[PDB]
């Protein structure tokens, strides 16, 4: 039997989960207009490509994004999902490739039944203490897969979704399904080895962490930045505004080269030292007021490469693999102050740069929306503090025309 | 009574009198080291002195030094008193508001001009050809912009800027000439190579085909006599150098090239005006002087634009001085005279009067 209020987790109660979601699907059909129902029908017919598009749409030029006819399906489906918000948390289930969480080898083969202690521990060490960014449309289940269910990988994600998460229950032929648009980071709180129908699986107990991510909506990001850093702009000492404007006006190159070469030890320059101190103090004046995603198009030199390095040809998979082996899971540190943007869109000045850092900035980190300073709004810039450290959680790749580019999912850790 | 026109660039100041067809004075935008040295002055004193460029990438970055350049302009180059002439200054596209204010403060408070105005360089260059609608490629010594303009208004959200221009091309030519087996490395040698660049370089219509040609013939070789009589040869460097504008990866830059920034600029404009822009691509500035550049731009934009698009590149012979000429025309216009900011208006309103009126 079923209670008259649903649980937060249907667990193994597949029969009630399916019936409840079937009722929900019927109820939500009352609230979708025909363009939204059209978007859903197209998704049933082309889910992989539509989901793929939804993961990387934001990285192109603003006018390329606007001109893509796939925007219609994306926006209409996203609207359909966004407005059926849950009234309390719910737990969902789905399978991932281990590669999704930067475990770039099999946990066990399809034919194997058990998972070694070795592999279990390797997996734990790889996915612990990391916040993994999730994007795009995804089909999830409200019940745990059991005997006779489809189970494509050895990795089962058991994810708690909070109140106000958008979820779209729907029917596809004989099947009741649940669609979400991922817009958050997940943390793996705990992994456990379980057995389902004679085979060992890893079950990852996962929760989410929200961050503001403006992606290609630079106007919205700019409004947010101006709202939070208009006062900041006015609250600096005259030395701090002076040293800040010097930095932004191109002084950054000397200041940062002094930092990178370890000038404060090898060539102490008290003038520069005072500027570094003032700018740092400026960045601590109004700490980043929410968890925030920022984007940086890195030069290859930040990753020990040049334009003519053979290893910078990411169109060859072996170079992507070599990149991952060197950087994925590592912590990197910038002695320099570091420019980032509120927006993910490509821009003329760095149109050809192949390495994109996508950085999770925890609330209260030092930082400032410099583009609140009336002098230059067209960067949508957030400046991060000198000596910042970033954990590289995961490396993804995508095609920009014929050129393979990398997205480094990173977290600011100090 | 006569107005002054001062077009201040990263490498050169072009200065003269409104009404004239050309600037009376063209001199380097440099200072050496209170009374510190300026126009060529700061190279004949390059010893106890280092030469400094106060305008960087089209933006004034040192106001003390820029006051010296402007002092030099009035008293030494034009031999006029600033108190006796309305003065039209030029500015880069997207010049910060505070920068234009500081230009205005200096003109009235330091030089005590009776009136002044600040005009956008690219808009002046479009105006020089009798146009008020078009997309300008302005490329000088320090910066290159794409500036779309519709009925006299620059469209700031579609302006593209690349910190890649003539001085970068000169430095690149020094490097690749040095790789050929010559040695161009010093300040004086940079001037020589600038001269080689201005005399012998060209943009190839098909770069990969041109490289193949040069590889398998001497047909593209030219000679150049150094000041000491040494004659040198230049080959594929003639076109590899300005190729950098279309392929900024040649100097380690991962930016779009000038054809792509032109396209990006047009694509940021309202769809209704894009054909007007395609049909009125105007080139301005010294770094647009390369033979072959208009044909190559035509070819590259043709490949990006819809197959039905009609594209025209306008590259007048005078385009090294297009900005200055447009300023000379503008300052002379009857309908412009009401637009001058007077000393009286400055006294009444702040430096911020320059937004009211410019
Ligand atoms: N890159 C971006 O995504 C971005 C975002 C917002 C604003 N901006 C704007 O662009 C300009 C800054 O440009 P930038 O960030 O491309 O230049 P940068 O000063 O960060 O980098 C200059 C060069 O140094 C390299 N570099 C930087 N830090 C390094 C390190 N720790 N080790 C080794 N190499 C290192 C870079 O790869 C590049 O080749 C500023 O005007 C800024 O406002 C850029
Ligand atoms: N015939 C030519 N061919 C190629 N380049 C040239 C030619 N004549 C001048 N130049 C280059 O053009 C530049 C000077 O042009 P211009 O005076 O338009 O620039 P600027 O206004 O000083 O700088 P900017 O506009 O970038 O601030 C120099 O780099 C010079 O070498
Ligand atoms: C005919 C001429 C043109 C010119 O454009 O010079 C400008 C100004 C010049 C100043 C430095 C030298 C030493 C002093 C020079 C007096 C020069 C008049 C020279 O520095 C440039 O040469 C730079 C360096 S090399 C290059 O590509 N841009 C641009
Ligand atoms: Ca200029």
From TrEMBL, chain A:
NAD(+) 3 binds at residues 296, 299, 301-302, 336, 353. Keywords: Coiled coil, Nucleotide-binding. NAD(+) 1 binds at residues 296-297, 301-302, 336, 353, 379. NAD(+) 2 binds at residues 296-297, 302, 336, 353, 381. Pfam families: ADPrib_exo_Tox (PF03496). GO terms for cellular component: extracellular region. The lineage of its organism: Bacteria, Bacillati, Bacillota, Clostridia, Eubacteriales. Residues 19-208, 223-412 form the ADP ribosyltransferase domain. One of its GO terms (molecular function) is nucleotide binding. This is Iota toxin component Ia. It comes from Clostridium perfringens. SUPFAM superfamilies: ADP-ribosylation (SSF56399). Residues 11-45 form a coiled coil. NADPH binds at residues 296-297, 301, 336, 353, 379, 381. NADH binds at residues 296-297, 301-302, 336, 339, 353, 381.
């Amino acid at each position: 039997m079923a209670f008259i209020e649903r649980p937060e987790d249907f667990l193994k109660d597949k029969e009630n989960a399916i019936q409840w979601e079937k009722k929900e699907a019927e109820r939500v059909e009352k609230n979708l207009d025909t363009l939204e129902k059209e978007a859903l029908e197209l998704y049933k017919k082309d889910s992989e490509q539509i989901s793929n598009y939804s993961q990387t749409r934001q990285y192109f030029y603003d006018y390329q994004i606007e001109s893509n006819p796939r925007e219609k399906e994306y926006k209409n489906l996203r609207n359909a999902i966004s407005k059926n918000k849950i009234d309390k948390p719910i737990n969902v289930y789905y399978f991932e490739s281990p590669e999704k969480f930067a475990f770039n080898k099999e946990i066990r083969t399809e034919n194997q039944n058990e998972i070694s202690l070795e592999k279990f521990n390797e997996l734990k060490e790889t996915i612990q203490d990391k916040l993994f960014k999730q994007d795009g449309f995804k089909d999830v289940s409200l019940y745990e897969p059991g005997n006779g269910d489809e189970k494509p990988t050895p990795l089962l994600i058991h994810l708690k979704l909070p109140k106000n998460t958008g979820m779209l229950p729907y029917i596809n032929s004989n099947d009741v399904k649940t669609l979400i648009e991922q817009d958050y980071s997940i943390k793996i709180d705990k992994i456990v080895r379980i057995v389902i129908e004679g085979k060992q699986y890893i079950k990852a107990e996962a929760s989410i962490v929200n961050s503001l991510d403006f992606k290609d909506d630079v106007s919205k990001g700019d409004l947010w930045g101006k709202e939070n850093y208009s006062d900041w702009s006015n609250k600096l000492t005259p030395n701090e505004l002076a040293d800040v404007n010097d930095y932004m006006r191109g002084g950054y190159t000397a200041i940062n080269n002094y930092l990178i070469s370890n000038g404060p030890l090898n060539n102490p320059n008290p003038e520069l030292d005072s500027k570094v101190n003032n700018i740092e103090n400026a960045l601590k004046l109004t700490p980043i007021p929410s968890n925030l995603i920022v984007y940086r198009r890195s030069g290859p030199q930040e990753f020990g490469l040049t334009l003519t390095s053979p290893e910078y040809d990411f169109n060859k998979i072996e170079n992507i693999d070599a990149f991952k082996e060197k950087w994925e899971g590592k912590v990197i540190t910038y002695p320099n102050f570091i420019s980032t943007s509120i927006g993910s869109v490509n821009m003329s000045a760095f149109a050809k740069r192949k390495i994109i850092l996508r950085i999770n900035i925890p609330k209260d980190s030092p930082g400032a929306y410099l583009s609140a300073i009336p002098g230059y709004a067209g960067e949508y810039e957030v400046l991060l503090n000198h000596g910042s450290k970033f954990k590289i959680n995961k490396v993804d790749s995508y095609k920009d025309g014929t050129v393979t580019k990398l997205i480094l999912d990173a977290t600011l850790i100090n | 009574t006569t107005a002054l026109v001062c077009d201040n660039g990263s490498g050169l100041v072009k200065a003269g009198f409104a009404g004239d067809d050309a600037p009376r004075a063209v001199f380097p935008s440099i200072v050496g080291r209170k009374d510190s040295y300026v126009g060529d002055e700061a190279q004949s004193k390059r010893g106890i002195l280092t030469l400094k460029y106060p305008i960087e990438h089209g933006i004034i970055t040192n106001w003390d030094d820029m006051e010296k350049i402007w002092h030099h302009t009035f008293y030494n180059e034009l031999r006029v008193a600033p108190e006796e002439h309305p003065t039209l200054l030029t500015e880069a596209p997207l010049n910060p508001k505070a920068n234009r204010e500081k230009m205005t403060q200096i003109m009235f408070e330091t030089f005590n001009v009776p009136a002044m105005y600040v005009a956008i360089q690219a808009v002046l260059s479009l105006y020089a050809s009798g146009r008020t609608t078009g997309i300008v490629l302005d490329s000088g010594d320090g910066v290159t912009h794409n500036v779309p303009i519709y009925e006299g208004y620059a469209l700031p959200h579609a302006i593209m800027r690349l910190d890649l221009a003539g001085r970068d091309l000169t430095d690149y030519l020094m490097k690749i000439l040095t790789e050929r087996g010559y040695s161009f490395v010093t300040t004086a040698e940079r001037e020589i190579v600038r001269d080689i660049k201005e005399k012998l370089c060209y943009v190839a219509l098909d770069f990969e085909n041109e490289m193949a040609t040069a590889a398998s013939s001497s047909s593209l070789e030219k000679s150049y006599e150094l000041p000491d009589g040494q004659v040198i040869t230049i080959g594929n460097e003639r076109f590899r150098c300005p190729e950098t504008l279309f392929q900024p990866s040649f100097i380690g830059m991962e930016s779009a090239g000038i054809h792509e920034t032109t396209y990006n600029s047009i694509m940021k404009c309202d769809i209704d005006i894009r054909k007007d822009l395609y049909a009125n691509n105007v080139m301005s500035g010294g770094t647009t002087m390369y033979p072959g550049i208009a044909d190559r731009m035509q070819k590259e934009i043709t490949a990006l634009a819809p197959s039905t698009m009609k594209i025209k590149i306008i590259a007048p012979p005078e385009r090294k001085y297009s900005v200055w000429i447009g300023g000379s025309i503008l300052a002379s216009l009857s309908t412009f005279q009401q637009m001058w900011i007077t000393k009286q208006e400055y006294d009444e309103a702040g430096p911020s009067i320059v937004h009211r009126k410019c």
